[PDB]
Amino acid sequence: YKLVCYYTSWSQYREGDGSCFPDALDRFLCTHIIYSFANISNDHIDTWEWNDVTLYGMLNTLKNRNPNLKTLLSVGGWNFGSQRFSKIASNTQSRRTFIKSVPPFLRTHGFDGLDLAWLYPGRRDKQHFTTLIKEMKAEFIKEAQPGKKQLLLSAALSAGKVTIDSSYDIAKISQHLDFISIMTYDFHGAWRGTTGHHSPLFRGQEDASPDRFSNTDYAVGYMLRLGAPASKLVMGIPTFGRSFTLASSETGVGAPISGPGIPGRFTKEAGTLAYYEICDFLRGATVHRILGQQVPYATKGNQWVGYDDQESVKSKVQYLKDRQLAGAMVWALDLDDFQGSFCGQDLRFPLTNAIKDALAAT
Ligand SMILES: *[C@@H]1O[C@H](CO)[C@@H](O[C@@H]2O[C@H](CO)[C@@H](O)[C@H](O)[C@H]2NC(C)=O)[C@H](O)[C@H]1NC(C)=O
Numbered sequence: 001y002k003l004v005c006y007y008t009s010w011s012q013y014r015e016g017d018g019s020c021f022p023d024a025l026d027r028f029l030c031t032h033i034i035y036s037f038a039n040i041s042n043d044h045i046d047t048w049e050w051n052d053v054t055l056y057g058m059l060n061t062l063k064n065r066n067p068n069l070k071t072l073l074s075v076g077g078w079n080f081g082s083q084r085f086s087k088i089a090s091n092t093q094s095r096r097t098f099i100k101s102v103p104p105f106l107r108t109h110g111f112d113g114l115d116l117a118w119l120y121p122g123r124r125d126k127q128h129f130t131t132l133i134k135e136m137k138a139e140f141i142k143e144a145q146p147g148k149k150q151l152l153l154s155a156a157l158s159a160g161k162v163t164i165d166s167s168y169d170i171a172k173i174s175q176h177l178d179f180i181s182i183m184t185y186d187f188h189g190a191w192r193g194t195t196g197h198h199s200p201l202f203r204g205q206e207d208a209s210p211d212r213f214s215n216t217d218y219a220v221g222y223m224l225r226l227g228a229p230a231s232k233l234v235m236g237i238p239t240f241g242r243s244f245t246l247a248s249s250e251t252g253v254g255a256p257i258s259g260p261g262i263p264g265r266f267t268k269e270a271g272t273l274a275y276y277e278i279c280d281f282l283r284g285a286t287v288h289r290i291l292g293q294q295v296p297y298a299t300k301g302n303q304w305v306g307y308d309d310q311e312s313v314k315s316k317v318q319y320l321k322d323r324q325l326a327g328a329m330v331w332a333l334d335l336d337d338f339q340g341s342f343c344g345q346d347l348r349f350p351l352t353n354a355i356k357d358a359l360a361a362t
């Protein structure tokens with residue numbers, strides 16, 4: 001199995017114990033660590049943060065004592081400008097300048113591959129996305145062709161049925177990608193105005209949600225049916241929760257809300273919490289395992305958060321092993337309890353170690 005784990009470069013700026021640099025990462029935890037994100041500037045791949053070159057080095061030094069560890073650089077992101085990617089991918093000359101810029105940059109900076117994070121191609125970009133992936137892989141084969149270790153090409157793909165149908169030619173891109181990470185979280189399965197879990201494993205109660213699509217199992221089965229080989233499909237597991245402010249005394253799934261949850265102290269983003277912030281939240285909270293969805297929510301006062309814990313990520317690993325998938329993907333290492341100081345067990349990376357342990361289990 002693969003355990004593909006993201007590190008985000010803006011996590012260095014979080015206050016106090018929230019600050020995360022690559023030298024806090026456990027070199028033996030994951031098989032692949034992906035650094036997010038690189039820019040595209042003047043149609044060339046390029047750095048984003050002022051100190052990316054320093055942080056690239058802190059990450060790649062982890063391979064010194066773990067020669068099996070691979071690193072990739074993820075280009076794009078969700079505040080990149082899909083308009084910007086679209087223009088780069090449709091223009092024949094821009095696309096070639098970008099492809100040609102990628103292997104020198106990865107070799108210069110010590111990376112083993114590129115992860116494409118175009119979030120998200122439009123219906124009008126579906127074929128451009130295929131062409132981009134085909135031509136990028138072709139350049140990687142050419143660059144290695146004299147006995148080099150070939151660079152890896154991965155892509156992070158939406159788990160949302162509407163985006164999958166509009167944006168991706170799954171069967172074609174799967175032939176060229178070394179692996180696909182399906183982003184099986186941030187689902188919006190609840191009726192408008194109500195709570196729901198953003199990463200359920202299955203639909204659960206049939207008469208309680210609008211659609212059958214907003215869950216991990218539907219997305220995985222669908223992408224396999226569309227032609228992604230199981231041996232290339234890496235299943236996303238979040239180390240963050242999505243939260244809501246409750247509008248009444250009701251606290252179950254589908255309870256009325258007035259808006260997103262109160263921001264966490266470190267991540268400062270209403271509607272989201274890192275897992276270590278959730279560990280803090282859990283003191284005084286009530287935890288419920290959602291029947292049929294195989295994941296917990298916690299509620300306290302007027303707050304409600306749907307998240308994954310050690311038990312639920314082991315169930316998700318059992319699921320992916322039953323489906324013979326390639327492994328698990330984790331967003332993100334800096335949202336796990338990487339310090340080991342919040343989740344009361346003294347253990348660093350509690351959620352990602354739980355995933356690692358389940359993948360290794362027999
Ligand atoms: C990422 O690259 C883009 C594209 O070059 C940069 O966007 C430019 O930024 C300058 C400085 O703010 C602006 O004056 C230009 O108008 C922008 N150009 C475009 C096409 O948007 C962006 O600054 C880069 N981001 C980084 C390095 O963090």
Ligand SMILES: C[C@H]1CN(C2CCN(c3cc(Cl)ccn3)CC2)[C@@H](Cc2ccc(Cl)cc2)CO1
Binds near residue numbers: 006181240269273
């Ligand atoms: C607007 C949504 C965006 N979503 C991202 C999750 C991560 N995902 C990727 C992207 C790639 Cl390339 C690869 C894997 N996953 C892209 C979407 C969450 C961000 C988040 C914010 C705050 C906190 Cl505390 C935790 C997570 C919640 O918000």
